[PDB]
C-alpha cells in the first residue's frame, strides 16, 4: 500500500509548513510528509513537508520533522524512490 500522509502544520508565529506526502499510486509506497507547525514562544517552527515519491516500489515517504520553535524548523526532504 502507500499514498496518504501529508497534513501536519499548526502552531503559529511562525508555525506553518507541513504539506507534502502524496505520491504512491502505481505499486504503492510514498506518503510521509506532514510535521512542521510549532512556533509559539519566541516564534520559529515551520518546515516539515517533503515525503511523497513512490509508485515504483523504491520506498518514498519520509519527510516530516520540522516544528519546534525559536528555532526549530527544517525537516522535509525524503520522497523520491
Amino acid at each position: 500500500x502507500x499514498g496518504x500522509x501529508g497534513x501536519x502544520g499548526x502552531x503559529g508565529x511562525x508555525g506553518x509548513x507541513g504539506x507534502x506526502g502524496x505520491x504512491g499510486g502505481x505499486g504503492x509506497x510514498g506518503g510521509x510528509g506532514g510535521x512542521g507547525g510549532x512556533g509559539x514562544x519566541g516564534x520559529x517552527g515551520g518546515x516539515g513537508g517533503x515525503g511523497g515519491x513512490x509508485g515504483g516500489x523504491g520506498x518514498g515517504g519520509x519527510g516530516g520533522x520540522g516544528g519546534x520553535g525559536x528555532x526549530x524548523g527544517x525537516x522535509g526532504x525524503x520522497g523520491x524512490x
Binding site: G6, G9, G12, X17, X19, X20, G25
Partner: protein, 81 residues
C-alpha cells in the same frame, strides 16, 4: 499567507484521491485541496481533496478538481471560512 496545498493525486486504477488542503495558520487563508488522479481505461478517477479551513480570514481553500476516468471523480468541498 495561506496554508500548504494538498498533494495532487496521480494516475492509476483508480486514480488516487487528492489530499485535503492544510488549514491556514493563524491569520492565513486555507490551502487548496489536491486534484484527483486520472484513471487508466476502465478505471475510476480520483476525488479532489477538500480545501483547508481558513485561519480566521474567511478564505477557505478550494476543493481539488476531480480526475477523469471511468467514471470521473468528484471535485472536493471548499474549505470552511
Amino acid at each position: 499567507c495561506k496554508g500548504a496545498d494538498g498533494a495532487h493525486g496521480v494516475x492509476g486504477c483508480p486514480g488516487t484521491a487528492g489530499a485535503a488542503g492544510s488549514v491556514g495558520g493563524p491569520g492565513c487563508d486555507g490551502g487548496h485541496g489536491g486534484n484527483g488522479g486520472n484513471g487508466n481505461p476502465g478505471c475510476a478517477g480520483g476525488v479532489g481533496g477538500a480545501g483547508g479551513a481558513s485561519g480566521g480570514t474567511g478564505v477557505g481553500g478550494r476543493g481539488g478538481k476531480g480526475g477523469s476516468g471511468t467514471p470521473k471523480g468528484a471535485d472536493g468541498a471548499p474549505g470552511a471560512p
